[PDB]
Design a protein around this ligand. Structure first.
Ligand code: JKR
Ligand code: JKR
Ligand code: 0G6
Ligand SMILES: *[C@@H]1O[C@H](CO)[C@@H](O[C@@H]2O[C@H](CO)[C@@H](O)[C@H](O)[C@H]2NC(C)=O)[C@H](O)[C@H]1NC(C)=O
Ligand code: K
Ligand code: K
Ligand code: NA
Lengths: 250, 27
DNA sequence: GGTTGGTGTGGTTGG
DNA sequence: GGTTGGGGTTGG
């Protein structure tokens, strides 16, 4: 997170750290959507151009964390993975279309002050919140520029499609949106490498609940003027999420 | 069913330092 | 079709 | 120091 600030405690209790076993390492962000299901970016798990390919037993998740490298005695809970479900139409070759994966944990996580799932949007929520100029919030432990000691947060406005399009040569699809301040706006901020998989969330002014509208997917550099962060469009992939969970069990 | 209401925030009727910026960005 | 679109027999992948 | 920096979001 570039040009963000330290999170307050229990500000983002659905935040999840994808943690590599050996060598021991932070890989990516993720989010908790129920007691046995975590949502992440597919490219965190599978990206052949970099020779990346992680299986269930290569990884752990850490939930309830604030500090980046300290084990938080009595706060955080660590879980093993039972199964990874990468979207079947993920496209790592071209433009990271459908950059999304679900992970089922081996055991249910007990909720607390510091561990709690985010809501996923429906049609109406999507239609009223995902609009240009509306701001959402991005969180993570990724790079502070083009490494922090506590979780970083930044608020960024959704950008209209034609501006997103004109900002990159990468082929944009309807499974993505972009966010960030325009050069002339003055305020600044972006996600960066290491933040992938983390949620773009918005608080509904109707029922005051936080909804995950996006997943940190890609960008070109970090916080460059006239460039914007790209996010997987969570509602557009909601039918797939409900299908996987309904079939494989909560 | 309990989703998206934070134990330290919404459940306590306390806000975080920056959510107001989000709310104001709507209409 | 599918846990999945269609340029529908491979492709960034089996059958 | 510890699974871990400098009470705390938690023992000793
Ligand atoms: P594994 O080794 O078991 O897989 C091989 C055997 C199963 O093969 C298939 C089963 C079902 C479908 C297909 C297939 O479908 C392609 C998409 C649809 O294409 P289309 O719109 O052109 O429809 C096909 C038109 C011709 O239909 C048939 C062709 C040959 C045989 C039969 C048949 O026996 C019954 C009905 C129709 C057809 C592509 C490849 C394999 C399989
Ligand atoms: P449980 O109840 O079985 O055991 C808990 C009792 C032991 O508690 C501690 C053990 C080790 C370290 C510390 C501690 O470390 C803080 C590091 C910073 O040092 P400082 O700046 O606080 O140094 C001040 C020195 C004060 O020394 C003492 C104070 C009181 C008692 C004693 C004593 O009995 C022997 C030697 C020194 C001191 C902080 C707190 C507890 C423990
Ligand atoms: C895996 C994630 O941590 C990371 C997030 C980057 C966020 N950037 C900004 N400024 N919001 N994503 C990446 O690193 C992705 C995955 C692989 C390469 N990549 C990129 O963003 C490239 N920099 C650009 C790109 C290459 C291939 C396909 C799409 C985009
Ligand atoms: C990523 O790694 C996994 C684990 O090695 C690969 O899964 C294996 O390879 C083939 C094809 O998927 C299958 O026989 C088995 O599922 C696994 N076999 C072994 C040897 O464990 C998978 O192929 C890799 N993914 C990609 C896209 O290359
Ligand atoms: K196919
Ligand atoms: K301590
Ligand atoms: Na920018």
């Amino acid at each position: 997170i570039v040009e963000g600030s330290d999170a307050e405690i229990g500000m983002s209790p659905w935040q999840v750290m994808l943690f590599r076993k050996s060598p021991q390492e932070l890989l990516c962000g993720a989010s908790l959507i129920s007691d046995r299901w975590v949502l992440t970016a597919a490219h965190c798990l599978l990206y052949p151009p970099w020779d990346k390919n992680f299986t269930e037993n290569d990884l752990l998740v850490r939930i309830g964390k604030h500090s980046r490298t300290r084990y938080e005695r009595n706060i955080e809970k660590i879980s093993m993975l039972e199964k990874i479900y990468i979207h079947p139409r993920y496209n790592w070759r071209e433009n990271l279309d459908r950059d999304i994966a679900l992970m089922k944990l081996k055991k249910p996580v007990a909720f607390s002050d510091y561990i709690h799932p985010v809501c996923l949007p429906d049609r109406e929520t999507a239609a009223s919140l995902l609009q240009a100029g509306y701001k959402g919030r991005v969180t993570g432990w990724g790079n502070l520029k083009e490494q922090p000691s506590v979780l970083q947060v930044v608020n960024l406005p959704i950008v209209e499609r034609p501006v997103c399009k004109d900002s990159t040569r990468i082929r944009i699809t309807d499974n993505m949106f972009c966010a960030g301040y325009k050069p002339d706006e003055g305020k600044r901020g972006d996600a960066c490498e290491g933040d992938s998989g983390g949620p773009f969330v918005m608080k509904s002014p109707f029922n005051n609940r936080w909804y995950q509208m996006g997943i940190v997917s890609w960008g070109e550099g970090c916080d460059r003027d006239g460039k914007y962060g790209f996010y997987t469009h969570v509602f557009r992939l909601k039918k797939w999420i409900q299908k996987v969970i309904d079939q494989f069990g909560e | 069913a309990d989703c998206g209401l934070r134990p330290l925030f919404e459940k306590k009727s306390l806000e975080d330092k920056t959510e107001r910026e989000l709310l104001e960005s709507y209409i």
